[PDB]
Design a binder for these strands. Structure first.
Ligand SMILES: Nc1ncnc2c1ncn2[C@@H]1O[C@H](CSCC[C@H](N)C(=O)O)[C@@H](O)[C@H]1O
Ligand SMILES: [Zn+2]
Ligand SMILES: [Zn+2]
Lengths: 231, 275, 672, 255, 226, 255
RNA sequence: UAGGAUGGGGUGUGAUAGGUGGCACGGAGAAUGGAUUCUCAGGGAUGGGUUCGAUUCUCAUAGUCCUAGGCUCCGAGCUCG
């Protein structure tokens, strides 16, 4: 991963930040794409001159486009994109014992940040990735998405969250088929309880390790991997 | 260039000859001892030019004039037929095209044989349950192999059929082989799924009969002929049917069709109707 | 006018085939000889007779008109509405004589164009008949020679330089322009006039060819003194391209005749079909005899000034480039024939097995095929060699002498000297037409051998008298060679008609050394006779002829040593055989056990049959089969059953072919 | 049995919704056709008789569906079954390097709005209406049936927005079934394959034949009456809950 | 509907198989109870009347199944539906810090999975001789593969392995038999005897699967959302 | 890292097992190739050097596998990783109406015994050896990796017995993860699909070329070194457990 | 064995002793609201030949369909010439 340039959506914290810290340590170059008011600027200072913070609202085409133009200015190319930004909401669809209905605005906001924002990033960075000169394996880039196991078995009150992550799960295969003739691999990670066995909470570093493994391995494509310790 | 000047002449004579000629087709032109053969070859080129230009003209004339799927182009259908072919190559019933007839065939016949093989394979791919096509006795450097690779271009390496230089007797138990030929004394009563049928890829316009029968009798293979007359009235028409009609008949019988449905692929100009 | 015209030599003048040409054209077809065996030769070499408009006969002689009856029957069966004959005016009388033993002009129409008639021209050829009278109404010193002049061919149109004056090219508007210039008319004033050679190839006046027959030295001077020949010979007007000479070699070597050909010019060719040709005419016949000889050599013996010697299928094109053409020349190679027999699936082992298993009178089967001549079997005939000095001919079909000459080669002259009598049993077009050929060849053989010229003895029905009487009176002298005995006088219940008849029949028994001669009436037609001969040695031979199982025949021929019976059809079609008055195999076979013969022989096989009939399991050790040119001796009777397996193997394909044809006829019936 | 049931059918003016209404009304149920105001459902409601009523309501909007449900409760007094058949399809590649076109965002948003958000907007309000019902013998109060697609599991090229919406419906089918299970409302999902709905019948005959041949068995486009049959079977069977049923003849979508 | 159809039910002497036979015979079908000789199935066959018959057979053997299918073809002349309800289970953990015994794994595997394939391959031989109806169908084959194939519990390794194999092989067999016109479907029965599933609801679902012509090559979880 | 780990690799004489032995031995892990004595296992072990050992054992037999594990324990004293790459296949249709043939029961049971029963036999016997290790930091005691080709999900025509066995392995993957969790052994499964394994050699090379071209990306057969890379990634990563990972470049099987 | 009828090698059909016109459908390869562009196959039985130009004009070979039969010459009137 030496010399490679990555754009990491949601890189100011969580799985995105852990991926940027590990990959840059391994000698890669990372672009942190996150909201302007996030504290990711301190992180981009911490990682040194190989890292750059690009302020962008993922739901807006213009903000992401200018962030990508910043990436083109700093490094000239994009090789990896990791989608991690998101929020969660717990609320039952309907509760007869209290007469309460899930509000539509909360559902729309979760869908906005999680599912459509991910596609917006994919569709724009694929335009950026298409400018790369093919790898000796024919590869132009790698796109990695995060769709927690809630897409498969959600808990009570996660309907909107499970809907968004199931959307990303359904979206993985058609995008991989879309970008296959361009040479971009699309992969999905299904994280669980990240901060039977292992019984502790997951460590974001194991997610970063899996991201590096997916980047390195040329044959992983169009698949969802549950990294959940079998719970 | 002597003959280029000669063709300019015949053209100056106003004969049916083409506007221009390429080097390789000129070297083909000198492959004909009889002046009549040169005439017929040249008329074939002239008529090719004639229709090519006529169609370009009509092409230029017409130019003056919530979906669920993106247009399902020709490639997607081709890939689906590819998957069906790849299954047929593993579990399908074998069907053999028996080469080695390259010696007996004039250039015109060899070209037409290649065209019929192309169409027959095309009809085979689209069918619901294709045969496993074998090309046996297919010489690598023979005339047919070079024409097939020319006609298919880079598709040739990707066709889902088995091409071999061996003979069919080296691949299958000799009891199960049946050489299909119109001259056979035995009449095909029913299509048998456990047998292997051999079709001679041989086009001669009905002109040297008994070649397939001679090859069969030289060996100890079983032989059969189609029951054309028994189940269909006849009139003026050869009984050696084209390769694509043979394959579409066998594909019809293979799918449990009856004779009165299978013989629909016989050209209607050859027979009046069913008995 | 036609664009191509060429000749072809069907027969090259060999003693067993005569000589004949064949003029080919796109619009008409012509022939110039109709002798014995010409019909068989033309069928063998695939010469179509469909559009044989005219037949030219160069001389009234049985060696030249021998196969005329066979052709007439063939043309009637082809469906031709009219055929026109040309030659001596006596043909009309000849045509009258033909109807006695046939029908009178049934369906088809016959016409005659004698030499005295005005010349006849067609769209492809103009024909002149030249009468020639020898030195020193029947006329025995007339020979007709033909001079055929072709039509003028318009020259080609020169298109390459036609654009120089600006004539249109590639449109139908030039069609009237081309027609005018090709006819010698100048094209009109298309800004200026253009005439004839300025745009058109000069015309070709036509190349003519001459056919000349000179049977003897007596005709040399009449040919030289003829004025009409000098009209074409000594001039430059279209010098006759080729002259076909049909004359014995002794005539050609004459100095006067030799100078006559040379005066035709240096470019003129000369074709000669004389008696010196060495070429095989019947390839299939040669193949079969060579093939069968591998089985038993004794039973199947082997057969036997610029100028151009004629060959079979030799051609000469006339309109195109005038060149000689050696492309259809027959090629005889015994090695290939024996190779084909050995490669048969079952032929080779059987003949080895047959050989490890192991004189007068002797019977030679010259002919066994029925009504019409076919490719392999000729018409009926049978030669019997009673003694080394005597022989008896049992039936004389058309071209019988040709088959006899091929079988015996140069020995033919000696055999005819031993020829004592000829038997005619029923007046069919395939049982008697070959008789006149035998008499003339017998006379020639007697002259060569130095034997005295004693008349031959013929025993035949009285109706044959009228046919020969008219032919002798009108066409060619024959009767001074024969002493004919009516067949009725040799019947079991016959009575002495005249003392003269008794002397001849008594003479026949002494000459042929027979102990007694008898005849009987079989039931085939009116005045149809059998025969039976008993020798002092004690052996008896009975000949049935065309018949069905009869009771009078059975009583007379009891305990015969060898019986020859008709086997036209098989067991499948006994009703048709009864309708056509013929016997089937089992009917004939049943007859043999009842007649209690030592051996049984079959003949008169039908035209449906190609090579062999069906060998039913009822075929015992006494019943045999006959083929052309086979030798049968009394000692070969035990051998004959052993030959059945090899003959089946050698004729695997044809017997296979006959069964498919019978199946196909059934299929058409079924599909009806 | 379905005798006497009252059904609310979204997208009922055509296709699977119409076939479901035709079956249930024919079998003796009552139906409310829920579709856009400008549609042709008014004719269909006349066709089905006085047991059926047309309610003009856009499923993306709360107020329309609430008005329609108030109409339904006024006319028949209860809601026993809900069938979700409304939806739209859009096909467009995410990005195409050869010519440089990119998937426009508004087509993605409006697909999510109609398919995924419209479905949840209907489910939560209908579940609100069924929550007032007296529980049937066995604790059940009602059944809600959704219409996913096989595109939710193996999307083809250009169905990113469509597959995203149907995958969201598949993902969310189980947590909602667990939410309303204590209340006694059953939630089920049907995943039809190639069906002869107007979305597919408008295609040319050649591609229609190609799509029909792709099904292993039976090799034909699904007949909407068979979808109505499975819907009825789900209504009758008390133990189908929180499951996705592929009604596709074992077909698998080639890329 | 299912009236007049002939169904072969393995394990038909009790449980889900028997409840399926009771439903189909009540609806007017004909049923053959194929079960072990000691199962007491002859009493159940006597209860359901002359439309039902019991054929003693051990499904893990080819001969017993062949004799039972011969008996069914003699009695009714036809086979239209096959339901595989036979099976056994164990609850031994793979390893217990003791090792899982091999004989129990072989026995449950061959009774569940091997018996099912043996029945499928022989009934398809019987089913292939029917004339296809107006829809082209020749028969329906229904299998049982408990939800343990997806969320197997502790100690259900052998059981979950067998049901997972049935789930995995449902689609390839459906693809194999598709040109013959035989539909193949799978049901995943959950906790059967907020209450346990009643076998009559399984029999109802089986009838629904038989009637609906377009369900093929699918696994249906009849589990009540557990 | 994998430095110092001891791995037992079944089917290690060729294909994926040899590729895995090559990678781990190259990375400094000691390996034991467990394969039938007929194979050239001892040649590969001699080639790989001192860190590789060939153990002749038949996986369907308890005593051979027990002997092989005893040999491994004697040589290296412990087992930390186990990889199950042994397997066989058969191409035979369940029933064939046209040819009138039926899949034999012996062939199905033989494939089932080698693929499915042999895998469980190895897991259950290795676990008895792994149960003796003192736990690694973090509660892990050992790792078990299985191979279940993509046929377990979308098996092709004529692949019923193989698909049934791999479907069983997929089904029982999670149950074993629940069984061994209290003792700290992780069980993982790889679905490699079209690889460099000789199973993709019995088929004609043209079928192999078509299948390779049909992979979305990269349009080629898998390289066994990529399987070994994924195996190392699984060994290193502590949180992958009881899950099936499809390694096929996103190809989906058509019949 | 003979005579005729005729042969569109992807399928239906025309311009019919010579100039004119072919039309509609189908197939192979490589790329994009069911259409488009390029490319491949375009010898009206097979092989010779003629004409300024041949599908139609001629021959040879092969396939295919249909069809293939028999005595009066004159008066005595079973025999006579
Ligand atoms: N009517 C028929 N009956 C049986 N086989 C036939 C047939 N028509 C064509 N075929 C088969 O398909 C091929 C092409 S037809 C060519 C016939 C062959 N070359 C010959 O000269 O006679 C043949 O090899 C034949 O085996
Ligand atoms: Zn006669
Ligand atoms: Zn006769």
């Amino acid at each position: 991963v030496k010399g490679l340039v990555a754009v990491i959506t949601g890189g100011a914290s969580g799985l995105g930040l852990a991926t940027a810290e590990r990959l840059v340590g391994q000698g890669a170059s990372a672009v942190l794409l996150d909201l302007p008011n996030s504290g990711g600027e301190a992180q981009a200072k911490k990682l040194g001159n190989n890292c750059v913070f690009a302020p962008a609202d993922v739901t807006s085409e213009k903000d992401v486009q200018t962030a990508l133009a910043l990436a083109k200015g700093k490094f000239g190319r994009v090789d990896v994109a990791v989608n991690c930004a998101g929020i969660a909401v717990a609320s039952k669809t309907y509760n007869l014992k209290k007469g309460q209905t899930h509000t539509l605005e909360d559902f729309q906001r979760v869908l906005d940040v999680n599912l459509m924002g991910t596609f917006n990033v994919i569709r724009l960075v694929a335009g950026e990735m298409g400018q790369n000169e093919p790898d000796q394996g024919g590869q132009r880039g790698v796109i990695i998405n995060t769709a927690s196991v809630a897409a498969f078995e959600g808990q009570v009150g996660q309907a909107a969250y499970s809907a968004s992550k199931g959307g990303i799960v359904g979206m993985t295969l058609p995008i991989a088929r879309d970008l296959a003739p361009i040479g971009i691999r699309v992969m999905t990670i299904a994280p669980g309880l990240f901060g039977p066995f292992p019984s502790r909470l997951g460590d974001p570093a194991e997610y970063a390790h899996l991201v590096q493994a997916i980047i390195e391995n040329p044959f992983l494509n169009g698949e969802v991997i549950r990294l959940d310790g079998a719970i | 260039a002597a003959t280029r000047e000669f063709i300019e002449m015949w053209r100056l004579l106003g004969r049916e000859v083409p506007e221009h000629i390429t080097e390789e087709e000129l070297k083909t032109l000198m492959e004909c001892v009889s002046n009549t053969a040169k005439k017929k070859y040249l008329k074939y080129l002239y008529t090719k030019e004639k229709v090519k230009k006529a169609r370009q003209i009509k092409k230029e004339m017409k130019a003056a004039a919530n979906f669920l799927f993106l247009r399902l182009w020709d490639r997607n259908m081709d890939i689906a037929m590819g998957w069906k072919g790849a299954q047929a190559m593993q579990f399908g019933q074998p069907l053999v095209f028996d080469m080695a007839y390259e010696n007996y065939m004039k250039r015109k016949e060899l070209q037409n044989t290649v065209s019929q093989l192309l169409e027959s394979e095309g009809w085979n791919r689209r069918n619901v349950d294709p045969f496993h096509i074998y090309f046996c006795n297919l010489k690598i450097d023979g005339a047919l192999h070079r024409e097939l690779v020319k006609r298919y271009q880079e598709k040739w390496d990707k066709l889902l059929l088995t091409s071999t230089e061996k003979s069919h007797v080296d691949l299958f138990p000799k009891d199960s082989i049946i050489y299909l030929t119109a001259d056979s004394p035995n009449v095909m009563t029913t299509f048998r799924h456990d047998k292997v049928y051999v079709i001679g890829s041989f086009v001669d316009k009905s002109m040297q009969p008994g070649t397939s029968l001679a090859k069969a009798k030289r060996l100890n293979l079983a032989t059969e002929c189609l029951p054309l007359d028994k189940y269909l009235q006849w009139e003026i028409g050869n009984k050696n049917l084209t390769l694509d009609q043979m394959i579409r008949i066998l594909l019809c019988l293979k799918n449990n069709g009856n004779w009165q449905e299978a013989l629909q692929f016989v050209p209607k100009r050859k027979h009046t109707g069913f008995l | 006018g036609p664009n191509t015209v060429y000749l072809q030599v069907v027969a090259a003048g060999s003693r067993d085939s005569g000589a004949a040409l064949y003029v080919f054209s796109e619009f008409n077809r012509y022939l110039f000889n109709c002798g014995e065996g010409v019909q068989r030769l033309m069928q063998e070499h695939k010469l179509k007779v469909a559009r044989l408009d005219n037949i030219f006969l160069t001389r009234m002689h049985w060696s030249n008109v021998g196969g005329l009856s066979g052709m007439i029957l063939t043309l009637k069966e082809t469906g031709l509405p009219k055929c026109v004959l040309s030659g001596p005016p006596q043909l009309e009388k000849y045509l009258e004589a033909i109807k006695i033993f046939s029908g009178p002009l049934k369906g088809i129409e016959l016409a005659v164009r004698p030499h005295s008639a005005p010349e006849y021209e067609d769209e492809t050829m103009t024909v002149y008949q030249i009468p020639i009278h020898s030195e020193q109404v029947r006329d025995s010193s007339l020979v007709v020679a033909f001079i055929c002049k072709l039509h003028l061919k318009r020259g080609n149109f020169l298109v390459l330089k036609a654009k120089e004056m600006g004539l249109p090219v590639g449109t139908a508007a030039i069609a009237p322009i081309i027609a005018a210039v090709k006819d010698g008319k100048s094209i009109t004033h298309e800004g200026r006039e253009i005439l004839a050679e300025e745009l058109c190839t000069p015309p070709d006046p036509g190349a003519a060819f001459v056919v000349v027959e000179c049977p003897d030295e007596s005709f040399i001077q009449p040919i030289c003194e003829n004025a009409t020949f000098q009209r074409y010979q000594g001039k430059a007007d279209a010098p006759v391209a080729l002259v076909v000479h049909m004359a014995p070699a002794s005539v050609l070597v004459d100095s006067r005749y030799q100078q006559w050909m040379e005066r035709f010019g240096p470019d003129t060719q000369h074709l000669v079909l004389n008696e010196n040709c060495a070429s095989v005419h019947n390839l299939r016949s040669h193949k079969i005899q060579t093939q069968l000889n591998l089985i038993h050599p004794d039973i199947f013996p082997l057969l036997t000034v610029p100028m151009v010697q004629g060959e079979c299928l030799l051609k000469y094109q006339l309109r195109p480039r005038r060149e000689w053409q050696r492309d259809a020349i027959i090629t005889c190679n015994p090695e290939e024939f024996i190779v084909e027999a050995l490669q048969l699936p079952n032929f080779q082992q059987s003949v080895q097995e047959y050989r490890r298993s192991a004189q007068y009178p002797e019977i030679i089967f010259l002919g066994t095929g029925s009504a019409i001549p076919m490719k392999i079997r000729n018409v009926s005939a049978t030669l019997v060699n009673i003694s080394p000095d005597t022989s008896l001919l049992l039936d004389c079909g058309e071209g019988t002498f040709g088959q006899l000459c091929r079988h015996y080669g140069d020995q033919v002259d000696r055999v005819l000297g031993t020829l004592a009598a000829v038997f005619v049993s029923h007046l069919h077009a395939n049982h008697h037409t070959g008789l006149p050929s035998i008499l003339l060849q017998r006379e020639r053989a007697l002259a060569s051998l130095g034997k005295p010229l004693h008349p031959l003895l013929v025993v035949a029905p009285n109706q044959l008298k009228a046919w020969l009487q008219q032919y002798h009176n009108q066409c060619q002298e024959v009767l001074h060679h024969i002493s004919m005995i009516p067949a009725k006088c040799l019947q079991e219940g016959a009575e002495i008609s005249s003392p003269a008849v008794e002397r001849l029949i008594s003479s026949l028994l002494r000459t042929c050394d027979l102990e007694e001669f008898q005849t009987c009436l079989v039931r085939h037609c009116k005045h149809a006779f059998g025969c039976a001969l008993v020798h002092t040695s004690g052996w008896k031979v009975v000949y049935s002829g065309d018949t069905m199982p009869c009771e009078a025949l059975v009583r007379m021929g009891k305990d015969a040593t060898l019986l020859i019976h008709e086997a036209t059809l098989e067991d499948g079609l006994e009703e048709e055989a009864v309708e056509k008055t013929h016997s089937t195999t089992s009917q004939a076979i049943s007859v043999g056990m009842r007649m209690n013969a030592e051996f049984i022989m079959l003949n008169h096989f039908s035209q449906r049959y190609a090579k062999v009939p069906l060998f039913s399991p009822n075929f015992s050790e006494k019943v045999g089969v006959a083929f052309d040119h086979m030798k049968v001796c009394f000692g070969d009777f035990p051998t004959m059953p052993k030959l059945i397996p090899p003959l089946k193997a050698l004729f695997a394909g044809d017997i296979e072919e006959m069964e498919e044809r019978r199946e196909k006829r059934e299929l058409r019936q079924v599909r009806a």
